[model samples]
Target: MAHSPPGHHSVTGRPSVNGLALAEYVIYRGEQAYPEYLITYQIMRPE
Candidate 1:
């Protein structure tokens, strides 16, 4: 997958009351140019 925007992994301090983590991230489907659908994408290399 391509690199995400800066601070996508930042801790937002949102409450994790329902077992969800306090930290959140932005998800971009491969081929998405943010607000514009680009292409079907996949991670070329995953560990």
Candidate 2:
């Protein structure tokens, strides 16, 4: 069995954020090993 790290883990689909303009942020939530946690991401415009 694999275990996840504690306290709000996050990841982004796009690797680089260098030319991110007019972007927005979003939050997703679910129950993991702990209760009441969130997953966040930045929505970037594709050049």
Candidate 3:
């Protein structure tokens, strides 16, 4: 398992909205160096 600490810039693409249209959602991933951290959620559309 991998983990990412809160407020940590894990990815290099800088993938968050900055200027006007803020992001309604975000997805994060972690490298092997860290273990699972505060990351929990689910999509229940159940399609």
Candidate 4:
């Protein structure tokens, strides 16, 4: 007998979003340095 995984179910009855927008940004500072680090940002919205 075949069994489905945990939390697995159909999503046909669910409503889907019409539009989505995603924006990303990356900032870094490094100038011939041995160790460097960077930061990033992510924004998401629905329209």
Order of all candidates by lDDT, from best down to worst? 1, 3, 2, 4
- Give the worst 10-residue stretch by lDDT in candidate 1: 25-34
Residues 1-47 of candidate 3 have per-residue lDDT tens digits of: 34445677453444355655533422364332555588789978876
lDDT of 2 by residue, 1-47 (tens): 23334564543345356676554432344443355678799999999
Worst 10 residues of 4 by lDDT: 24-33
Over 4 Å off, model 2? 1-37
TM-score of each: 0.18, 0.19, 0.18, 0.18
Q: How much lDDT does candidate 4 score?
A: 0.40
Best by lDDT: 1
**Candidate 3, number of clashes:** 0
CA deviation > 4 Å runs, candidate 1: 1-21, 30-47
**What are the lDDT scores of the predictions, listed in order?**
0.54, 0.48, 0.49, 0.40
Task: For model 4, state the Cα shift of residue 47 in Å.
Answer: 23
In angstroms, how far off is 21's CA in candidate 4?
2.3
Model 2, C-alpha of 35: deviation from truth (Å): 6.9
lDDT of 1 by residue, 1-47 (tens): 55556657322355658575556554445443346566888868866
Candidate 1: the clashing residue pairs are: 31-39
lDDT tens per residue, model 4, 1-47: 23334465322233345345344322232332355667687886878
